[PDB]
Design an enzyme around this catalytic site. Structure first.
Site, PDB file in Angstrom:
ATOM      1  N   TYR A 104       0.808  -1.208   0.000  1.00  0.00           N
ATOM      2  CA  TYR A 104       0.000   0.000   0.000  1.00  0.00           C
ATOM      3  C   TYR A 104       0.842   1.259   0.000  1.00  0.00           C
ATOM      4  O   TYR A 104       1.999   1.248   0.418  1.00  0.00           O
ATOM      5  CB  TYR A 104      -0.953   0.021   1.198  1.00  0.00           C
ATOM      6  CG  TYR A 104      -0.268   0.333   2.507  1.00  0.00           C
ATOM      7  CD1 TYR A 104       0.324  -0.674   3.253  1.00  0.00           C
ATOM      8  CD2 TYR A 104      -0.213   1.634   2.997  1.00  0.00           C
ATOM      9  CE1 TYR A 104       0.951  -0.400   4.446  1.00  0.00           C
ATOM     10  CE2 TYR A 104       0.414   1.920   4.192  1.00  0.00           C
ATOM     11  CZ  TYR A 104       0.994   0.896   4.912  1.00  0.00           C
ATOM     12  OH  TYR A 104       1.621   1.167   6.106  1.00  0.00           O
ATOM     13  N   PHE A 131       2.069   9.887   3.343  1.00  0.00           N
ATOM     14  CA  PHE A 131       2.162   9.864   4.804  1.00  0.00           C
ATOM     15  C   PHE A 131       2.630   8.509   5.328  1.00  0.00           C
ATOM     16  O   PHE A 131       3.117   8.411   6.453  1.00  0.00           O
ATOM     17  CB  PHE A 131       0.847  10.289   5.474  1.00  0.00           C
ATOM     18  CG  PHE A 131      -0.340   9.450   5.091  1.00  0.00           C
ATOM     19  CD1 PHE A 131      -0.582   8.231   5.707  1.00  0.00           C
ATOM     20  CD2 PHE A 131      -1.232   9.898   4.135  1.00  0.00           C
ATOM     21  CE1 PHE A 131      -1.679   7.470   5.358  1.00  0.00           C
ATOM     22  CE2 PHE A 131      -2.331   9.143   3.784  1.00  0.00           C
ATOM     23  CZ  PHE A 131      -2.556   7.927   4.395  1.00  0.00           C
ATOM     24  N   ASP A 132       2.485   7.472   4.507  1.00  0.00           N
ATOM     25  CA  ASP A 132       2.869   6.120   4.900  1.00  0.00           C
ATOM     26  C   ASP A 132       2.968   5.209   3.684  1.00  0.00           C
ATOM     27  O   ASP A 132       2.349   5.471   2.652  1.00  0.00           O
ATOM     28  CB  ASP A 132       1.852   5.549   5.890  1.00  0.00           C
ATOM     29  CG  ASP A 132       2.336   4.278   6.558  1.00  0.00           C
ATOM     30  OD1 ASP A 132       3.566   4.081   6.645  1.00  0.00           O
ATOM     31  OD2 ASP A 132       1.485   3.478   6.999  1.00  0.00           O
ATOM     32  N   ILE A 138      -6.881   1.699  10.260  1.00  0.00           N
ATOM     33  CA  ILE A 138      -8.038   2.590  10.253  1.00  0.00           C
ATOM     34  C   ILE A 138      -9.218   1.928   9.555  1.00  0.00           C
ATOM     35  O   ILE A 138      -9.042   1.114   8.650  1.00  0.00           O
ATOM     36  CB  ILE A 138      -7.746   3.957   9.602  1.00  0.00           C
ATOM     37  CG1 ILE A 138      -7.128   3.779   8.213  1.00  0.00           C
ATOM     38  CG2 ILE A 138      -6.849   4.793  10.499  1.00  0.00           C
ATOM     39  CD1 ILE A 138      -7.066   5.062   7.412  1.00  0.00           C
ATOM     40  N   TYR A 165      -8.993   9.588  10.216  1.00  0.00           N
ATOM     41  CA  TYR A 165      -8.510  10.312  11.389  1.00  0.00           C
ATOM     42  C   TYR A 165      -9.401  11.493  11.777  1.00  0.00           C
ATOM     43  O   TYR A 165      -9.174  12.149  12.797  1.00  0.00           O
ATOM     44  CB  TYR A 165      -7.062  10.763  11.184  1.00  0.00           C
ATOM     45  CG  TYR A 165      -6.106   9.608  10.985  1.00  0.00           C
ATOM     46  CD1 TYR A 165      -5.547   8.948  12.072  1.00  0.00           C
ATOM     47  CD2 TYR A 165      -5.779   9.165   9.712  1.00  0.00           C
ATOM     48  CE1 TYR A 165      -4.682   7.884  11.897  1.00  0.00           C
ATOM     49  CE2 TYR A 165      -4.916   8.102   9.527  1.00  0.00           C
ATOM     50  CZ  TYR A 165      -4.368   7.466  10.621  1.00  0.00           C
ATOM     51  OH  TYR A 165      -3.507   6.407  10.440  1.00  0.00           O
ATOM     52  N   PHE A 199      -5.351   5.717  -0.907  1.00  0.00           N
ATOM     53  CA  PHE A 199      -4.479   4.557  -0.771  1.00  0.00           C
ATOM     54  C   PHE A 199      -4.338   3.784  -2.074  1.00  0.00           C
ATOM     55  O   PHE A 199      -5.324   3.372  -2.669  1.00  0.00           O
ATOM     56  CB  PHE A 199      -5.005   3.613   0.310  1.00  0.00           C
ATOM     57  CG  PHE A 199      -4.699   4.056   1.709  1.00  0.00           C
ATOM     58  CD1 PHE A 199      -3.520   3.677   2.327  1.00  0.00           C
ATOM     59  CD2 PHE A 199      -5.597   4.840   2.412  1.00  0.00           C
ATOM     60  CE1 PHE A 199      -3.240   4.075   3.617  1.00  0.00           C
ATOM     61  CE2 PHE A 199      -5.323   5.242   3.702  1.00  0.00           C
ATOM     62  CZ  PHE A 199      -4.142   4.859   4.307  1.00  0.00           C
TER      63      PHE A 199
END
Length: 107
Positions: A26, A36-37, A56, A82, A99
């Site tokens: 991902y 962010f990730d 999440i 979030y 994503f």
């Protein structure tokens, strides 16, 4: 909720189940394109467990609608991510998350 835009189809038959370990690649981005990730930078699959509250809500909800071998763009609203608080670091309040996800395996 969660919007799914397919980039590569899965088998359309084999979807994540309760008790299974989901194996994915991902990459998470804000709407403005900023990362962010990721699991792709470390070049190894990321594992998470259905129903075990390990990611999440929106991410799991999206993955649960993906079949084996599918790569898709998941668009996730803030309320299943979030929300109004955002998170320490990159993610600001009311962040719709993007994503790039590939469902590699179910264990």
């Amino acid at each position: 909720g969660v919007e799914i835009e397919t980039i590569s189809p899965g088998d359309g038959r084999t979807f994540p189940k309760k008790g299974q370990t989901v194996v994915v690649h991902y990459t998470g981005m804000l709407q403005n394109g900023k990362k962010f990730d990721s699991s792709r930078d470390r070049n190894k699959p990321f594992k998470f467990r259905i129903g075990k509250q390990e990611v999440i809500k929106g991410f799991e909800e999206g993955a649960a609608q993906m079949s084996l071998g599918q790569r898709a763009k998941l668009t996730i609203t803030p309320d299943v991510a979030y929300g109004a608080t955002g998170h320490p670091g990159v993610i600001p309040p009311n962040a719709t998350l993007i994503f790039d996800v590939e469902l590699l395996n179910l264990e």
